[PDB]
Amino acid sequence: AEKVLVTGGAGYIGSHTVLELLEAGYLPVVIDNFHNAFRGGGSLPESLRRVQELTGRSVEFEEMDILDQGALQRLFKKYSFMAVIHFAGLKAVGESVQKPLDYYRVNLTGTIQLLEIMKAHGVKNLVFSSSATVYGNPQYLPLDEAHPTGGCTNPYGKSKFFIEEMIRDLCQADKTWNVVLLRYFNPTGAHASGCIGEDPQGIPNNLMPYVSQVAIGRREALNVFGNDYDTEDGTGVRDYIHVVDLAKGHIAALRKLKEQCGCRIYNLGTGTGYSVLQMVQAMEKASGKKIPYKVVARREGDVAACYANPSLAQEELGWTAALGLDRMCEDLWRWQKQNPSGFGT
Amino acid sequence: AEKVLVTGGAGYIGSHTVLELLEAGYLPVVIDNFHNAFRGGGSLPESLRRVQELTGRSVEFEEMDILDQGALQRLFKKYSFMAVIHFAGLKAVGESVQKPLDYYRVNLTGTIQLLEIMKAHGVKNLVFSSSATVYGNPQYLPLDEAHPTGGCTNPYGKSKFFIEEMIRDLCQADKTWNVVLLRYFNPTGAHASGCIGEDPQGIPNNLMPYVSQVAIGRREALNVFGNDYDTEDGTGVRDYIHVVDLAKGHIAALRKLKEQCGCRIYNLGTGTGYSVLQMVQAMEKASGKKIPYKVVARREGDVAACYANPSLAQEELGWTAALGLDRMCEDLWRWQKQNPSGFGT
Ligand SMILES: NC(=O)c1ccc[n+]([C@@H]2O[C@H](COP(=O)([O-])OP(=O)(O)OC[C@H]3O[C@@H](n4cnc5c(N)ncnc54)[C@H](O)[C@@H]3O)[C@@H](O)[C@H]2O)c1
Ligand SMILES: NC(=O)c1ccc[n+]([C@@H]2O[C@H](COP(=O)([O-])OP(=O)(O)OC[C@H]3O[C@@H](n4cnc5c(N)ncnc54)[C@H](O)[C@@H]3O)[C@@H](O)[C@H]2O)c1
Ligand SMILES: CC(=O)N[C@H]1[C@@H](OP(=O)(O)OP(=O)(O)OC[C@H]2O[C@@H](n3ccc(=O)[nH]c3=O)[C@H](O)[C@@H]2O)O[C@H](CO)[C@@H](O)[C@@H]1O
Ligand SMILES: CC(=O)N[C@H]1[C@@H](OP(=O)(O)OP(=O)(O)OC[C@H]2O[C@@H](n3ccc(=O)[nH]c3=O)[C@H](O)[C@@H]2O)O[C@H](CO)[C@@H](O)[C@@H]1O
Ligand SMILES: [Cl-]
Ligand SMILES: [Cl-]
Ligand SMILES: [Cl-]
Ligand SMILES: [Mg+2]
């Protein structure tokens, strides 16, 4: 059978997706440059070594950079792909503002190179990791797919928006292409085994991992970025979605490609928003630990609330997020507890 | 630190700007890969060989691709540039629609690589070839710099907008950068000698070379892309600007950089729009020939009408386009007539 190329597959979302692909019967080939994934010293990134263990199925892997055209060329010659799921990229907002060129290079040039090879090799079937960030500051809520996109505030968000645009143009230009752009909301949680999850290096920029790190006792308290927002409790409201649900949405997307769907765009969110305080309360509950916090200044670029209108995905992808708040917290806690320092032995 | 690097210097706008540079006392270094240029009889592309003749000055040139990192690196090690004028890229609205990836690769990836090399060598002064296409479908006329940018109608325009955006980000991250973004309107005309001008390969994509070719009898007739636009005669309205005036605008831009201007954006237009039909008329008058045209469908990617508000350039660059319609046609005609087959065969 033909394979499924998974770029950046050793990462957070990708590893979970590889697991789901294997469980669903697909044959994945992962490529990763270890920019944000732990090695271990063996042939696989630790995340994938564990996915193999958990599923009892092999993960084919090639260490490589999407910026390496020559390596991409050889890869497409070595394997017969039927689709590509593209997670590879840089995603640190703060870092993007500081080093815009790095983001444009990895994100834009890398994606362009990958699209050229796919075109060249006749693998015109893509699933792309996009983000609700492309919508910019919400003009209305919930955010549906027709909400305006662009006018992003940082280089990171801009790069995702530009990528979306490039893919739209490609599909318009060649009707034989099929591409599903998935706008993730706030991915959280980990596989139920507690053996894989998000492995942030240093201080996590996202709320959840910070909260769990406070709970585990690695951090003293949570700094809450403002409490004067226009929300019920004044703290920011987001659509947290279980990474496992998110991963399953990728399989639904592959199925969509098989229907020769052309260019499709879907939000991958729950449609339910929770505030920072509500997330802390739930994590207290899942962890059985106290989670102290302190209200600090607002974070530059943050908005009051951001949550999805997941109807389209349900309708067309037949996908809906299954796991709730408690499950997300329980699963995150399990991973955190079982792996206090993330990956290694 | 004396030289000025000119990418795509063998092309239409580039060759003319090389000439103005020489005459203004600058020391240009030109690089071109001949995608849309004519390899002379020697090393130099024919255009530059002629430029040398006209100016009595020498042109340093190096054949290379902005896509070649290695070559760029060497180049920047070889010379000490005080600034860069970046003309290299793909430039047709309609063709972009059918070939988005080529535009994205050459324009975006080419520009990013260029910017990385510049930054890495402390060459932080730039003159960029932007376009009125970044304004997308005009919301009002004439177009001032503050008119919204983005929401482009074609990949070419999207590519230019994205580049503008990246540059703005770069300048933010590094205050020491000086970058002048020139939104050219429709370049036309030719050097007064008739020795150089636009030398399109195959069927001309743009209005004037096609019109002129009909006149010299190289084309049977002109195809007019739609007559149902919201314009006086229903045909496309554009701000045609003489290539010589554009070139002079570039010297003014180089001067602007001396003020440690940072990020600046200026329209380079005349402020006068002309219809497709009006252009034909003017060329009929200039060539005294018969110019037959067939009305056809609207072309994907084209806007109805667009012309510049050139106040800002006037005020800040101390620049205005002098050359009028008759002059542009006479100049275009002279070049066409003296060079019926372009720079050679
Ligand atoms: N995590 C989120 O909250 C979030 C939200 C929306 C969208 N996204 C997007 O989803 C994707 C996956 O996000 P994630 O949370 O799993 O991040 P991640 O960093 O864990 O995974 C990305 C993977 O890409 C690899 N990579 C980076 N640059 C590479 C390159 N040049 N070549 C090859 N591999 C390279 C990294 O080493 C890493 O394993 C990213 O594109 C991200 O921008 C994530
Ligand atoms: N031409 C217009 O009507 C217009 C108006 C707005 C913006 N611009 C821009 O100004 C620039 C020059 O326009 P022009 O009319 O002179 O076009 P042109 O095609 O004559 O000039 C572009 C030049 O770049 C060279 N080139 C292309 N790809 C290259 C690569 N990868 N490496 C090196 N050289 C390469 C081509 O060979 C050519 O000599 C382009 O960026 C164009 O988009 C022009
Ligand atoms: C500016 C920024 O980072 N935007 C990113 C962030 O948005 P986003 O704000 O949605 O997600 P975060 O995880 O960073 O924050 C969620 C909420 O928690 C708050 N919070 C967060 C961390 C913390 O220590 N304290 C605290 O109070 C934030 O203000 C917000 O209200 O995550 C999305 C998912 O990765 C990305 O696509 C966005 O690009
Ligand atoms: C190839 C070229 O130089 N394109 C330039 C032109 O774009 P632009 O697309 O406006 O230029 P064109 O010469 O292709 O089009 C001008 C007008 O002429 C019409 N037309 C054109 C050709 C033809 O055979 N028949 C016909 O009717 C078009 O529909 C349009 O209304 O100016 C822009 C700035 O404004 C530049 O950024 C572009 O680089
Ligand atoms: Cl294979
Ligand atoms: Cl940078
Ligand atoms: Cl293409
Ligand atoms: Mg409003």
Write up what this structure looks like:
The structure is a homodimer of 345-residue chains. Chain A has 345 residues and is of the alpha/beta class. Chain A has 2 domains: 189-238 and 270-345, UDP-galactose 4-epimerase, domain 1 (Alpha-Beta Complex); 2-188 and 239-269, NAD(P)-binding Rossmann-like Domain (Rossmann fold, 3-Layer(aba) Sandwich), CATH 3.40.50. The first copy, chain A, is built from 11 helices and 14 strands. One uridine-diphosphate-N-acetylglucosamine binds next to helix 6, helix 7 and strand 8 of chain A. Chains A, B: Pathway: Carbohydrate metabolism; galactose metabolism. Chains A, B: Keywords: Carbohydrate metabolism, Disease variant, Galactose metabolism, Isomerase, NAD. Chains A, B: NAD(+) binds at residues 11-13, 32-36, 65-66, 87, 91, 160, 184.
Topology record:
2 copies of one chain form a homodimer.
Chain A: E1 3-7, H1 12-23, E2 28-32, H2 46-55, E3 60-63, H3 69-78, E4 81-86, H4 93-98, H5 100-121, E5 125-131, H6 155-173, E6 178-184, E7 186-188, H7 207-215, E8 222-225, E9 237-238, E10 240-242, H8 243-258, E11 263-268, E12 274-275, H9 276-287, E13 293-296, E14 305-306, H10 311-317, H11 325-338
Parallel strand pairs in A: 1-2, 1-4, 2-3, 4-5, 5-6, 6-11, 7-10, 8-13, 9-14
Antiparallel strand pairs in A: 9-12
Bound molecules: nicotinamide-adenine-dinucleotide (NAD) (2 copies), uridine-diphosphate-N-acetylglucosamine (2 copies), chloride ion (3 copies) and magnesium ion (MG).
The site of one chloride ion has 4 residues of chain A, from helix 5.
